Amino acid sequence: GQKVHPNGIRLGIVKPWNSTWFANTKEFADNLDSDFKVRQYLTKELAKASVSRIVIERPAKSIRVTIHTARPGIVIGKKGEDVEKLRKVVADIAGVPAQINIAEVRKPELDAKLVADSITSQLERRVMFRRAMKRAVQNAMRLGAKGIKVEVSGRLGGAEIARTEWYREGRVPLHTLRADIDYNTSEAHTTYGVIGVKVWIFKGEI
RNA sequence: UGGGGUAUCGCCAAGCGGUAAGGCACCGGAUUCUGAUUCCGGCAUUCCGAGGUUCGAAUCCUCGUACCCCAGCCA
RNA sequence: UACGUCG
RNA sequence: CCCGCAGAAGAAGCACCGGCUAACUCCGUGCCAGCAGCCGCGGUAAUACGGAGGGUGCAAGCGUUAAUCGGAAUUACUGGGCGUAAAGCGCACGCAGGCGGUUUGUUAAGUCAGAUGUGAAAUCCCCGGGCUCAACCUGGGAACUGCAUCUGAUACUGGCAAGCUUGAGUCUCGUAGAGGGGGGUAGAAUUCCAGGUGUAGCGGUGAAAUGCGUAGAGAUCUGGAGGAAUACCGGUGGCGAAGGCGGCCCCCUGGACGAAGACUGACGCUCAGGUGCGAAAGCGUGGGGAGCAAACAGGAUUAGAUACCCUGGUAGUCCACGCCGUAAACGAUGUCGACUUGGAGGUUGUGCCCUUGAGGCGUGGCUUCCGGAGCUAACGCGUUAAGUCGACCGCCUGGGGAGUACGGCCGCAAGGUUAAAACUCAAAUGAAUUGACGGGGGCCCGCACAAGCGGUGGAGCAUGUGGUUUAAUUCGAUGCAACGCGAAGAACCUUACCUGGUCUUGACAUCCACGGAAGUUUUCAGAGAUGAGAAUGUGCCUUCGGGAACCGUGAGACAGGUGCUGCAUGGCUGUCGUCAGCUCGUGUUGUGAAAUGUUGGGUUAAGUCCCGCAACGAGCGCAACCCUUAUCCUUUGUUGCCAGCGGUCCGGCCGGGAACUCAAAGGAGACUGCCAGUGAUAAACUGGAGGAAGGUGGGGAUGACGUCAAGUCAUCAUGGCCCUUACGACCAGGGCUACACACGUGCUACAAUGGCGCAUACAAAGAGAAGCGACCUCGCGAGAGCAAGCGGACCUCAUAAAGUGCGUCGUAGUCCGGAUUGGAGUCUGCAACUCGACUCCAUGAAGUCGGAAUCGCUAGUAAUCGUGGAUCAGAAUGCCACGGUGAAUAC
């Protein structure tokens, strides 16, 4: 087990943080756990909506949750009853007056959360993994994407030993720190157990 | 049955009446991935059992035990 | 295990 | 056989389903039961076992077994092989056998053509015919591949007769040669013997010892004897059928090759049995015996050493005659002949040309190296074939058993030769590829070794582990990469363990139905929760049947599990290793596994970079981008700073100043950029200047493809299995702290480079509200009381300590060392007995520099000195950080 998380080593360099509140030591743990609850809830209740990121920020006793998603229409719905329902329950969880926004992730096959969730969904619909991976690399390289690597792992095809079998195309410069590597990871709970899907997407060199 | 010999650390084997020496083993450490080899340290038998002489017995004397050797013949 | 492919 | 009757009515199994081989899942079993033709399945999710569902193949059959042929070109006549897979006799001579150049004539035996007789019938085959069809029966033909006789043909083969020269042989003349046998001789050297000189070692080895030596060795000189071998020439040189043959000379003798010419005229090639020759060792008889040397003996080495090494040493090696009859007797390649591109040599002839020299042009014989086509599994062979053919011989038929046993023949014997079987395995083998490995080779690196400094192993204690104990001593981690590791902190809690007491839809969920707002202070029993009471209950809506929140009660569906499996998993981690590597696309090469690229010449920290190159490019990695540190500039200047000012309670203390330290943001800076030299004028290297810094400046982060079925199911998630009045839950007490022992990692020591007392100087980095907690008072002290200030460059923790200056101690188990133990306390916490931390008084072990062994470090490093933080109510000698002083050494 030996590679650094390629989001974490780029946190001040190119990648931003998904939480951008300041807090002293008295409420740092409380704000942090409140963020675990709103991302847990808001991740479970938008499983069909293809959600990429949820960014929390707290401007002066009020949360401001931004849902980067690929299907904004299914998040908002017929006149946005679903949004006001979500800020009602996020205001229930965080205990502050909640705002909520939706940012449309166009080009959803270049986002690693959406790619890993895609391949994970296909693996738990019992399709063969080489199609899922290989299709994901092809259609991601089709639109921009100066590199992509996907990597499934663990008891693939229902075996009794676990393999990995990664694929990559293009250039994925993972030790370069100015590389805009969009990396994310999902787990596929199949009837044989968990299958881990990692995906790195190299977008640009700065 | 008689004569001679032996009995001393777990094993083989030195001990001169005032102290128990050697090797193998065993115990601890080290070398080594681990074991053997190796290296460094240790321990250890109040001496077959009983009685006696002596200031003092593994040592000397007597008896018993256990095991060896030699003889047990001429008719 | 284990390699059998589409609008 | 035909017609009528009644009604789908009387009528489907067997094998197989992992691959071969058509046809798949579930359940049971868990290296068992069992299956199987071969490969092989079965040790918990088995398409292979047993059952079921489903399917597949055949069908009044279907499977198994036995037997034959096929596949099997694995006995090869069609139709195989033999350098290395099994297989070329050790080499020749040669009989019987097989084969035989060229021309003409005759024959016509083989060969061919036709005819005749026969080749029984049935059967097979073809065209028809009859049973409703088919099987079956049957008509006619074809066929029976043969044999015999007669008639012809005469190209090939054979017979016969005659020839001919291109095959084979004879003669003439020379050439080279370690060809053979017999005889003689010569020179160096070794050993021995006799003698001279001379004196303390010689010999031997990795080191030694045995051995020889003051009875005079070894060294050295002279004389002698004897035996064997023949330096230099000496050469992938020569000769020989092969084995083999090495001074020089003589005698007897075999073959080869060349030049011109003559002669014979197919006299040739191969060869089973047969015969001969046949290294070395060995055997017999008789000699010889210097060296060397099986056996043997001694010395060593070693765990042992019947060995390698040393010192001796007999058979043997040498000669004569006889035997044996074999070798990796090997070009692992039978003999003879023919044809098929080349190059460089060697050796031995011969012809021609100015031989104008150690030349030029040819033509033979033998031989070496490399290569073309071709062949070959590949490796390689390649006009001396393993190419393209012909003749004859020998041999092979999976590995082992076994070239063995029995029998025969041979042999003095040792043994040789010929040559099986039972049984057993599903491989054995060849060549080549990728890797790994090597006590193989070349180049290169790292505190790897070396050069040093300080440790560990010895002592006491701390902490972890193994073991032992226990009611339990919870579980996990175990070479490196487990062992102050998970645990950044076990009194209760944590806690998972043990002993008891208890609960069962539950401590934690969601959904019901009923009742009641919840909540708040009380008392009794017991270890807590269960029970008994008093107030408060309406927090807002409901054609009232209820809903918001919370608590009891009842059934459940469930909840719960730190239970098992890290060898079913994810995620996260260690490690080789921050080692420089790991690959891919397209192209090409190879039958192919694969190769190339990626290797080679340099260079680099680096598959770094240049150059070359059947490669051209690309990716992950290296480098850079990131953080920090080292210098300067700009901005802002509080709480931070004080150079110049003013006075000053002399303290940045105040007014004030924004220069400086500093703070933090933004820039500059270092890139082999410049110079000289060396280098493929290339990469680069070495040196120099400037500069705070010089060549990835220092440090960190960053850890490629993969390896260890490495670690974790106990952080979490998770497949399957398992418990679900219990393996779940609550509680109190205990344990995780036990202690004959052993190991790991640390701390403190053994002191004078120090101990103690007094004074005194210089830090950095941090933390802080249920917190850090000044000042002041009390206490010897740990601390206590009152209590400012500070959520913080402002206040507090908080005095840095080693250092320095004085005094003392004086080499003592001591004024070292502090363990251990008694007493007295402080704090935290419901609670310090098991089982805290600290203080005071007293006690004052072991220990005087640590055996074998072992570890860390290359410069602000090691060493040494303190300070802070996380976890935490309290508990660090650990961990993570911070600064002070500050080395040695690298050939």
Strand D close to A161 by CB, under 7 A: yes
Q: What is the dihedral of CA A14, A19, A25, A26, to 10 degrees?
A: 170
Specify the DSSP class assigned to residue A103.
E
Q: Is A106 exposed, middle or buried (0-12, 13-18, 19+ CB in 10 A)?
A: exposed
Question: Which ranges of A45-157 would DSSP assign to H, the alpha helix?
Answer: 72-76, 81-94, 112-123, 129-142
Task: Using alpha carbons, select from A167, A171, A174 the residue that is nearest to residue A198.
Answer: A167
What does the alpha-carbon distance between residue A111 and residue A118 come to, in Å, rounded to a whole number? 10
Q: Which residue has the tokens 């904004």?
A: A72
Strand D close to A12 by CB, under 7 A: yes
Q: List beta partners, residue A187.
A: A196
Which sign, positive or negative, has the C-alpha torsion A72, A54, A201, A198? negative
Strand C: which of residues 155-184 in chain A lie with Cβ below 7 A? 157, 159-161, 163, 165
Task: Using alpha carbons, select from A163, A101, A161 the residue that is nearest to residue A130.
Answer: A163
| Rounded alpha-carbon distances, angstroms, from residue A24 to A55, A97, A99, A198 | 20, 20, 22, 35
Strand D close to A44 by CB, under 7 A: no
What does the alpha-carbon distance between residue A5 and residue A155 come to, in Å, rounded to a whole number? 23
What does the alpha-carbon distance between residue A202 and residue A145 come to, in Å, rounded to a whole number? 6
What does the alpha-carbon distance between residue A44 and residue A28 come to, in Å, rounded to a whole number? 24
The HSE-up count of residue A10 (CA atoms within 13 Å, CB side) is 21
Cβ A34 vs Cβ A94: under 8 Å: yes
Task: Using alpha carbons, select from A18, A110, A15 the residue that is nearest to residue A65.
Answer: A18
Task: Using alpha carbons, select from A89, A95, A162, A177 the residue that is nearest to residue A129.
Answer: A162
| Rounded alpha-carbon distances, angstroms, from residue A173 to A25, A79, A177, A178, A182 | 37, 44, 9, 9, 12
Secondary structure of residue A118 in the 3-state scheme: helix
Where on strand D do bases come within 7 A of a protein Cβ?
A: 45, 568-578, 618-627, 701-706, 709-711, 717-720, 768-769, 791
| Rounded alpha-carbon distances, angstroms, from residue A114 to A32, A58, A140 | 25, 26, 11
Nucleotide nearest to A159 (CA to C1'): C1
| Rounded alpha-carbon distances, angstroms, from residue A102 to A21, A32, A49, A53, A94 | 19, 22, 12, 10, 19
Secondary structure of residue A49 in the 3-state scheme: coil
User: Resolution, in Å, please?
Assistant: 4.5
Residue A80 CB partners (closer than 8 Å, separation 6+): none
In this structure, which amino acid lies at residue A39? R
Characterize A82-98 residue by residue with b for buried, 16 or more Cβ atoms within 10 angstroms of its Cβ, and e for exposed. bbeebbeebbebbebeb
In chain A, the N- to C-terminal Cα span, in Å, equals: 28
